[PDB]
């Protein structure tokens, strides 16, 4: 269960890394997609859709817009599993 979450986070990391051409080592729960990870508007849109695909979920733009850091998107994926 705790190990589930860790492995899940490791998978979320890989997507964000790959998408934003960034080292996993930079993809901390704190890291902000724009400010720290160097993502523009198109990057964020493609990232959301990439995460949506990978973990087979959906995120409405009303709550997709609230997210700023990777931790936000992590916590989001954990709720909608």
């Amino acid at each position: 269960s705790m190990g589930y979450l860790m492995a899940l986070f490791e998978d979320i990391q890989a997507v964000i890394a790959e998408q934003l051409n960034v080292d996993a080592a930079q993809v901390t729960p704190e890291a902000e997609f724009v400010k720290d990870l160097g993502a523009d508007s198109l990057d964020v849109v493609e990232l959301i859709m990439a995460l949506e695909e990978k973990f087979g979920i959906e995120i409405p733009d009303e709550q997709a817009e609230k997210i700023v850091n990777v931790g936000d998107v992590v916590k989001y994926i954990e709720d909608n599993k």
Binding site: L42, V45, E46, M49, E52, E58, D61
Partner: protein, 151 residues
Amino acid sequence: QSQFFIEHILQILPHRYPMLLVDRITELQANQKIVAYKNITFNEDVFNGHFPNKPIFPGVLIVEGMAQSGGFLAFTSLWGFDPEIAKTKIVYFMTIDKVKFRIPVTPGDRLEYHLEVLKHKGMIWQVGGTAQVDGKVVAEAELKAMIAERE
């Protein structure tokens, strides 16, 4: 409606000469797919430059045609044939992928656009498919676009 002519296309797409590259829509299934086409004739300004003595329709304009078809599908899927609400958005081309050119397209060809919806969420549309001449594939592409308030 399932068949749209140039008069209909003009009311929906903001593109005008020389960048309107869809002549007719022959098949439309909301949120699913579209079949449209552009006639290719020697009497187009492009062929002056591409190329002198050998007219070949630019592969990037095939992709543009497909994108325009995809755009028409996205709009009428979300708002139907609404020329008035058409005049409150233009459509932005986000990405292009997996483009392959197979056969040259020339004056005399009817260039058909076959696009499936690959994914759509709200306002972002991802479509892919082919361009065909006489039931043979001449080109392939995937692309992503989103809708934006116009001018």
